[PDB]
Design a protein around this ligand. Structure first.
Ligand SMILES: Cc1ccc(CN2CCNCC2)cc1NC(=O)CNc1ccc(F)c(F)c1
Ligand SMILES: Cc1ccc(CN2CCNCC2)cc1NC(=O)CNc1ccc(F)c(F)c1
Ligand SMILES: Cc1ccc(CN2CCNCC2)cc1NC(=O)CNc1ccc(F)c(F)c1
Ligand SMILES: *[C@@H]1O[C@H](CO)[C@@H](O)[C@H](O)[C@H]1NC(C)=O
Ligand SMILES: *[C@@H]1O[C@H](CO)[C@@H](O)[C@H](O)[C@H]1NC(C)=O
Ligand SMILES: *[C@@H]1O[C@H](CO)[C@@H](O)[C@H](O)[C@H]1NC(C)=O
Ligand SMILES: *[C@@H]1O[C@H](CO)[C@@H](O)[C@H](O)[C@H]1NC(C)=O
Ligand SMILES: *[C@@H]1O[C@H](CO)[C@@H](O)[C@H](O)[C@H]1NC(C)=O
Ligand SMILES: *[C@@H]1O[C@H](CO)[C@@H](O)[C@H](O)[C@H]1NC(C)=O
Ligand SMILES: *[C@@H]1O[C@H](CO)[C@@H](O)[C@H](O)[C@H]1NC(C)=O
Ligand SMILES: *[C@@H]1O[C@H](CO)[C@@H](O)[C@H](O)[C@H]1NC(C)=O
Ligand SMILES: *[C@@H]1O[C@H](CO)[C@@H](O)[C@H](O)[C@H]1NC(C)=O
Lengths: 317, 317, 317
C-alpha cells in the first residue's frame, strides 16, 4: 500500500505530471562558410572539356527558406538551348527504325519535348524520334564521377535558433552570450557548439559525404529541447542529432537523390537562347522540436483525482 | 453498473487512452513532370503578338521550399523597362485634366512610380500623371483569356514524405519498397499511389483547373497519419485529401489569385534595362499532420484512477 | 466541502477541460506594396559614386517561401568579378610583409579565395596575400550609413491566413467577408485589420526600423488563435503580436544582422564575368499558432473521474 504511494508519487515526479507542457516555437537562421576549388575533366557531347574555377557562397548556395538550406555539390550543364526541332537523345524509348515508330504530337515522361512524328538521325546511322523543344536536348548522362564540389564536407554551417513558449512567456535562443564561438560541434567535445561541419554530419549518421554528393541527398539536423520551466529543477538547452531523410531508393523510377533543373536565358544574334543547368547537392532540413514544462495546479489536482481512487482500490486489495 | 464497466472499458479501447500519442515530424520532397506547348495570341500595347514555345521544368517551376511548390500557369510580360520619367498607365486614379491634378512627389498604391506633379499625354488626347519609375509602366491589363500554360492539369507531381516519431523512435516514409510506381492516385483505385495529377486534384476539391489557372490560386494537399505504434493492432499509412486554401475573394482590393512580379536585368547600348514579368500560377501547399500512439502504463493508470471513482459513484446511483 | 465543489466545477469551466483541443493548421499568403526612391552617394573602391533609381516590388522582394518573406533594405554591389588571381583585400589577417607570410593553397574563413602563397601589393606599399578567386575581391566595407531603401518603414504587408482544424472539421480564414480593407492595423484602433506597416511593426516591438535596416534583421509576426468550437460560447479570431527574433548579438564572429551574397553572371569580350551583390534587409517570419476546443464527453468523464475521488477525500478532511 505504501509502496503504491511511493510508486504513484514517483510516477508523478518522473513523468512531471505536476507540470504543464507547451509546444515550442522555432525560428532558424543559417550562415554557410567555405569555398571550393574545382578542377575536373568532363565529357560533354562526346568531347573532353575542362571545368576550372573557384566557388564561393553565391556560386553554390542561397539563403535558407522554410527552415532548410541547400548546398550544391555537383552539376551538369547544357548550354545554347533554343526553341526548335531536334532529334531526342537516343534512349531505349526514343529510338525509331522508321518514321512509323514516332507518333506526331506524342509526349513522353523521359522526353523534354513533343514529338513531330518523324524519325531522324541523332548521330551516324542511329535514329531517334524528332521532337520540338529546347535544342539540343540535354544528354541522358550520369553526374561527374567525382563530385565537382566534393570539398563541401569541409564546409561549415552556423545555426542560430530562437525558440519561444508563448503560454509560459519564455523566450530563449540556441546561442547564449559569451560562448566561445571558435569551435566545431562534436558529439562529446562541443555538443553545444552551433558550428557544424557537413562531413561530420554525414559521418554521424553513418553515410559517406562524397557518395551522396555525387547524386544529391537530403540530410536532416534535429534540435531537441527538453525545457523545464520550474525554478526548482530548471533546464532548457538543445540536443543536436543527425538523421538522413533521403529515401536512398536507388531506382530510376523514384527519381533518387536531390537534383533540379534551372535555366539562364540570354539573347545572341537576335535569337532567344537558354542555358539549362542540372543541379545536384545535399539539402539540409533543420527540424526543431521542443516541450516546455511549468508547474500547474489544475493538472496536479487532476492527477491527484486519479490517485485518490487508485489508493482506495489499493487498500481494497 | 456492469454496463458502466463495459462503457468505460470500451471508451478506453475506442479512444485508445491506454496509448500515448506523439506529434509527427514531416519532411517533404517533390518532383514535377510534364511539359506544355504554348501557342497563343496576346495583345501587347495595343498590337497583336504571338507567344509560341515549349515549356519544360526549368521554364515553369522551381524546387520546393518550405513544404510547398509552385507551378506557373499564365504570365504577362513587359519588356525593355528602364529608369526614367513616363506617364502612368491611364486608370481612374492616374488621369489628369491639367497639371493641377498631379501632385509632385505623390505615390499611389496602384502606381509603380513617384509622380513628378506634371500632367502629360499617355496616348492621343488622354492625359495621365507623369511618374518616375521603370518605363514604360506595365499595362493594367487582364491575364490571357486562356491560360497560356493551360496544359498544367496534365502535369504530374510525385511526393516523397518522410515522417519520424522521436519519442517512440519510429521512422517511416510515404513510399514503401516494391510498390508499383506506375500509377496515378485515385480516391479509390490507388489511394496510396504518390503520383498525383493536378487536374485530378482540382476536380477532387470541386474546382475547375483552367479557371484558377487564368489568375492563379493556392491548392492544398493534406496527408493524414493515424499511426498506431502497438504491436497488437498496428497501422501507419497516409491518407491523402485535397482542400482549396485560396481565399477566392474575387475583389480587386484583396489582391485575388496567386501572382507575383519578378524582373530580369540586362544592359543594351550602355543603358541599364529590365524585363518585368507578372507570373500567375497555382501554388501547392503540402500539409502533413500525424499522431503516433504506443501503449503507456502511466496514462492507463491515470485513466484507471478516474475510472475507480466513476465506479464507486455508479454503485451509489 | 461545497466550496470545493464550486472550485472544482469552476476549475473545469475555466480550464475548459470539458472541451477537447486540437492543434491548428496554418497557410500563409502575403502581398507587399510600396516603392522606394533611392538617391545616395556611396564610396566604391575609394571613389565617390551615385546610386539613383526607383525600386518597386520586383527590385526589392520576392514571394513568400515557407511562411516568411524578406524585404531588402540596403545593399553593397561589387561588379565585374571574373575568375583570376588577385591580392586579397587588406585586413588584419590578409597582410603580408614578405612572400613567407602567405601559405600556398591556404584558405581563410574571412577570405573568399585560395592563397597562391605569394605576397603582392594591393595598393601603394601595402601588401596582401595573393589569392585565386572572383576578382577583384569585394571590399571589407560597412553598409551604407543611411539604408538606401530606408523608405521600407512606409511599406505595407497584407497577410491572408487560412487555418483548418481537421479533427473538428472547421476551416476559417484571417480575413472575413465584408471587412473594410482600407485600414492600417493598430494595436487598438484596427486589431483585426491585416494590413500592416513595417515601421509600425518595429515600433510595437520597440526597435528603430532604420537601424535594423542598415545591417538587416529578422522580425516576427505572431498570430494567435484562441478558438472555441462550442456553440454556447463561440469565438475564433486572430490576435496579432510582434516579436524581434533577430539575435542582435553585435559581434563580428556571430555574423550579425541579416545579409546574403548573390551573383549575376554575364559574358563580356568572350570572358565570363559576375556581379556579386551583398544584400541586407529585414526578413519577416510569420508564426501562426492556435488551439481549437469543442466539447468532448470522454474528457469530461475523465475529469469527473478525478473529481469524484477528490470529493471523497474532501469529505474525509
Ligand atoms: C552552377 C555554376 C556553374 C559554374 C560556375 C563557374 N563557372 C563559371 C565561371 N567560370 C568558372 C566556372 C558557377 C556556378 N554557380 C552559379 O551559377 C550560381 N547559381 C546557383 C545555382 C544553383 C544553386 F543551388 C545555387 F545556390 C546557386
Ligand atoms: C516566364 C517565361 C516566359 C517565356 C518563356 C519562353 N519564351 C521565351 C523563349 N521562346 C519561347 C517563349 C519562358 C519563361 N520561363 C522562364 O523565364 C523561367 N523562369 C521562371 C519564372 C517564374 C516561375 F515561377 C518559375 F518557376 C520559373
Ligand atoms: C539589387 C539591386 C540594385 C540596384 C537596382 C537598380 N539599379 C539598377 C538600375 N538603375 C537603378 C539602380 C535594383 C536592384 N534590385 C534587383 O536586382 C532585384 N533582385 C533582388 C535582389 C535581392 C532581393 F532580396 C530581391 F528580393 C530581389
Ligand atoms: C578537406 O580538408 C582536409 C584538410 O585540409 C583535406 O585533407 C581534404 O582533402 C579536404 N577535402 C577535400 C574534398 O578536398
Ligand atoms: C513576459 O515576462 C516579462 C518579464 O519581465 C514581462 O515583462 C512581460 O510583460 C511578459 N509578457 C506578457 C505578454 O505579459
Ligand atoms: C576559444 O577556444 C580556442 C581553442 O578551443 C582558443 O584558442 C580561444 O582563445 C578561445 N576563445 C576565447 C574567447 O576564450
Ligand atoms: C490533357 O491531355 C488530354 C489527353 O491527352 C488532352 O485531351 C487534353 O487536351 C490535355 N489538356 C490540355 C489543356 O491540352
Ligand atoms: C531506435 O530503435 C533502433 C532499433 O534497432 C535502435 O537500434 C536505435 O538505437 C534506437 N534509437 C535510439 C536513439 O536508441
Ligand atoms: C504496374 O502496373 C501496371 C498497370 O497498372 C503494369 O502495366 C505494370 O507492369 C506494373 N508493374 C509491375 C512492376 O508490376
Ligand atoms: C514615410 O512617409 C512619411 C509621410 O509621407 C515621410 O514623412 C517619411 O519621410 C517617409 N519615410 C522615409 C524613410 O522617407
Ligand atoms: C465537414 O462539415 C461539412 C458541413 O456541411 C460537411 O459537409 C462535410 O462533409 C464535413 N467533412 C467531412 C470530412 O465529413
Ligand atoms: C473604410 O473606412 C474608410 C475610413 O476608415 C472610409 O473612408 C471608407 O469609405 C470605408 N469603406 C467602406 C466600404 O465602408
Amino acid at each position: 500500500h505504501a509502496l503504491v504511494f511511493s510508486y504513484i508519487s514517483f510516477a508523478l515526479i518522473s513523468d512531471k505530471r505536476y507540470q504543464k507542457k507547451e509546444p515550442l516555437i522555432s525560428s532558424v537562421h543559417t550562415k554557410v562558410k567555405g569555398i571550393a576549388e574545382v578542377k575536373a575533366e568532363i565529357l560533354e557531347n562526346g568531347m573532353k572539356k575542362m571545368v576550372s574555377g573557384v566557388f564561393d557562397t553565391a556560386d553554390y548556395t542561397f539563403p535558407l527558406q522554410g527552415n532548410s538550406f541547400f548546398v550544391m555539390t555537383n552539376f551538369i550543364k547544357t548550354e545554347g538551348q533554343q526553341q526548335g526541332l531536334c532529334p531526342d537523345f537516343p534512349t531505349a524509348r526514343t529510338i525509331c527504325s522508321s518514321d512509323r515508330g514516332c507518333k506526331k504530337g506524342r509526349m513522353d515522361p523521359q522526353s523534354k519535348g513533343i514529338q513531330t512524328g518523324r524519325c531522324v538521325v541523332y548521330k551516324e546511322r542511329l535514329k531517334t524520334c524528332e521532337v520540338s523543344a529546347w535544342c539540343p536536348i540535354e544528354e541522358v548522362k550520369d553526374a561527374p564521377r567525382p563530385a565537382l564540389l566534393n570539398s563541401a564536407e569541409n564546409f561549415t554551417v552556423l545555426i542560430k535558433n530562437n525558440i519561444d513558449f508563448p503560454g509560459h512567456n519564455y523566450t530563449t535562443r540556441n546561442i547564449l552570450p559569451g560562448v566561445n564561438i571558435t569551435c566545431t560541434f562534436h558529439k562529446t567535445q562541443n555538443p553545444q557548439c552551433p558550428i557544424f561541419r557537413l562531413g561530420d554530419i554525414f559521418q554521424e549518421t553513418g553515410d559517406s559525404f562524397s557518395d551522396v554528393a555525387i547524386q544529391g541527398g537530403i540530410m536532416g539536423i534535429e534540435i531537441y529541447w527538453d525545457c523545464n520551466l520550474d525554478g526548482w529543477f530548471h533546464h532548457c538547452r538543445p540536443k543536436y542529432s543527425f538523421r538522413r531523410l533521403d529515401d536512398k531508393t536507388t531506382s530510376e523510377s523514384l527519381y533518387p537523390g536531390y537534383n533540379f533543373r534551372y535555366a539562364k536565358y540570354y539573347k545572341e544574334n537576335n535569337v532567344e537562347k537558354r542555358t539549362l543547368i542540372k543541379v545536384f547537392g545535399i539539402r539540409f532540413d533543420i527540424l526543431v522540436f521542443g516541450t516546455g514544462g511549468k508547474f500547474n495546479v489544475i493538472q496536479l489536482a487532476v492527477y491527484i483525482g486519479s490517485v485518490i481512487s487508485y489508493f482506495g482500490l489499493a487498500t481494497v486489495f
